[PDB]
Design a protein around this ligand. Sequence first.
Ligand SMILES: *P(=O)(O)OC[C@H]1O[C@H](n2cnc3c(=O)[nH]c(N)nc32)[C@@H](OC)[C@@H]1OP(=O)(O)OC[C@H]1O[C@@H](n2ccc(=O)[nH]c2=O)[C@H](O)[C@@H]1O
Ligand code: GCP
Ligand code: GCP
Ligand code: MG
Ligand code: MG
Ligand code: MG
Ligand code: MG
Ligand code: MG
Length: 311
Amino acid sequence: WRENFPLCGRDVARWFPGHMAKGLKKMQSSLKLVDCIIEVHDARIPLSGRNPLFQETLGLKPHLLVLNKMDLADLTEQQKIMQHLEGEGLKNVIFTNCVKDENVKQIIPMVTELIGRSHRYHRKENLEYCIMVIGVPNVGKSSLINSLRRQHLRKGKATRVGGEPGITRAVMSKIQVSERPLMFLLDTPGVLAPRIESVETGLKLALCGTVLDHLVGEETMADYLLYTLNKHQRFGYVQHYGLGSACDNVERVLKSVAVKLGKTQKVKVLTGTGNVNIIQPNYPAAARDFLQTFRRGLLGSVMLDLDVLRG
RNA sequence: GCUACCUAAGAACAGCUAAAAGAGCACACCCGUCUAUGUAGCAAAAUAGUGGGAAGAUUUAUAGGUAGAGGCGACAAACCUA
RNA sequence: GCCUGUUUACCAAAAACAUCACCUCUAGCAUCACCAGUAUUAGAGGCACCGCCUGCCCAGUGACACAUGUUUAACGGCCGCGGUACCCUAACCGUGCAAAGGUAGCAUAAUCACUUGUUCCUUAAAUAGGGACCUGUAUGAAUGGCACCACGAGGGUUCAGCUGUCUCUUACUUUUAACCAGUGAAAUUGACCUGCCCGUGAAGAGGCGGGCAUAACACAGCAAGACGAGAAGACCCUAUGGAGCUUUAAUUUAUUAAUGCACCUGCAUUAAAAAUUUCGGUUGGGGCG
RNA sequence: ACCUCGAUGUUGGAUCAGGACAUCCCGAUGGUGCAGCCGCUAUUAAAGGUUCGUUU
Ligand SMILES: *P(=O)(O)OC[C@H]1O[C@H](n2cnc3c(=O)[nH]c(N)nc32)[C@@H](OC)[C@@H]1OP(=O)(O)OC[C@H]1O[C@@H](n2ccc(=O)[nH]c2=O)[C@H](O)[C@@H]1O
Ligand SMILES: Nc1nc2c(ncn2[C@@H]2O[C@@H](COP(=O)(O)OP(=O)(O)CP(=O)(O)O)[C@@H](O)[C@@H]2O)c(=O)[nH]1
Ligand SMILES: Nc1nc2c(ncn2[C@@H]2O[C@H](COP(=O)(O)OP(=O)(O)CP(=O)(O)O)[C@@H](O)[C@@H]2O)c(=O)[nH]1
Ligand SMILES: [Mg+2]
Ligand SMILES: [Mg+2]
Ligand SMILES: [Mg+2]
Ligand SMILES: [Mg+2]
Ligand SMILES: [Mg+2]
């Protein structure tokens, strides 16, 4: 740990493919079949960047927030997470975990009276509550369909689940979720943003895996773990990957893990005499494997919002 | 007499790494992933390269068996003389 | 998707089918499959190796009720210190002192008498109970979901190299080519002495109208037109034209399987297997009359 | 529902582009709330030109 991040004109990365451009006009074509809107985010990013569009555009149905990924999260400061959301205007938040289905039972109260607290306009006679989940990629929207299908319908899996952003393609059909009070979920492709706030807020959202690692950079994401595992005093990468004691240079930490994993690469280096090939430790493969252990949870439960928690 | 499966009694499977592996590399063999040529063609489905398997749920010679309201089928509602 | 395998000979090799393992169903048995077998077997299937946990459709009173824990109980070694002994070897006395203790009530698995159920009489409404008696009151289950260790001519993504893929093509060689010689097809083809522009027209003209152009013929290229050639468009519709398949469509039960007034045979009932025949007209995309 | 169901093949792309001008640039002018620079608009002009990538 030396100081903060020298971004030095890093510039925001931007990924807006045909998923979110086409999805938005198929999401906005279907607000007559929606009784509630579910916001699903990472618990690593509750406050800093949620979404530019989704907050103020969608106001007709009331909001409920589902901050998923609570197993890789420390909630000693749960009291003030509510504080920044209460001051925003966001009232109810349900933190969920989706391997033991922890606190996933508790939402099934908290949707039923919420539609009852408000008006329904057209669907005054319908007993079937068709509700919609929307959000940025890779946060827990498709697993929320399958966890809620598991513990209430006791039926099974209805949506493809496996960790890489963008392998669900478009707006699919309805999915039965429960028999006790009836409720249908609509699955959406993850609309992230046309523009992503600032540069620092861009990397906080890019770190959880919601964007491909190519447009941002594997070693660019690699140094930002060293910002958040050394300045937070959460030195939790030194019992799995303990190199000598602890380091803050991205050059040194990608060195020693490549020895421990046995990584080799053959790179055309460009010296002044000509093009020669030198065998090097595989710095992208070291930047890959250092990022996967972060997402598995074998590096420590971290908050990414300590920079905005200061004050 | 093709083909699908079966019966009878037969045959084939180098070298290499490993040891009793429906193991790995790889011939002979079997199959046909991709490309190109070919499209009245060499061929009513082939050639050249690249590929999958190649001691096994393998491949194959010979003789027999099941026949159409049927046979046979590791279901492609495939195959039963184009 | 577990894997090796398997499949549409001739447009699909796959994520499909198969696969151990697991689960459900049927069968207590001989001489022609199963099988010269016998429930750890055989058949019919489902799912896909192994791995992980979710509680249960015995209705009552009251008592049985476990360590673990709680209901709650005494005394002394090494050594330290103050003294009395005294060349010394070092002693003696008076003390301080850790752990060590597990009677025994009690939420609390062990298993059962009791309006409690059967049956039968009064009302001839159930007056609302009298009885007669007693039901070893059969082990209290057993099904869904998750899950990457390898593997893959599977579907995506990526690091690095690499190379005419590309920027931007070039050179050469062979085949082809063109020409000379020999042999010699095929689709195609109303007749054509077969131009361009604008207009026209069955709505896109070589042929019609008004202009324009125009000696005649070979050879090599080109692919804009001849709605170019090949195959009575696979999409849409029609036919009281077919066929495959499925049923809770109609008509049937001869046929097999059961019983009826040992098998056979003759008439009935309930099923299984099927057989035969059709699927009006008017809006078809409807946001589902 | 007019031509074609005795076959008029389906978007973009590659290649080659022919044309219109209702002009995006270059050229020539009128007006400006046109100081200069940038512009805005109109007239005139089709000779020439109109890039390379990321994303299924
Ligand atoms: P990649 O090379 O990006 O894929 C190319 C795509 O071509 C498609 N396509 C061919 N012909 C089409 C057509 O007549 N009409 C459409 N709408 N698309 C056509 C196309 O879609 C089928 C391809 O990409 P994908 O299949 O991956 O889907 C993206 C596709 O979605 C459409 N879209 C995106 C965003 C938005 O705001 N509106 C849209 O309509 C685009 O067509 C886009 O290509
Ligand atoms: N180590 C670990 N992994 C988890 C945990 N929970 C979820 N995962 C992982 O994340 C899951 C993937 O989530 P998924 O909904 O498929 O994300 P996605 O990549 O955006 C897929 P799609 O594009 O279809 O929406 C699984 O791959 C895997 O179980 C956890 O508690 N621990
Ligand atoms: N560690 C952990 N991760 C979880 C848990 N639950 C959900 N996740 C994660 O949530 C992520 C999935 O988000 P996802 O539902 O796929 O977002 P999406 O919008 O559908 C992606 P797309 O853009 O394609 O639409 C995954 O990285 C992973 O499953 C959990 O209990 N633990
Ligand atoms: Mg099938
Ligand atoms: Mg009639
Ligand atoms: Mg009608
Ligand atoms: Mg037609
Ligand atoms: Mg014709």
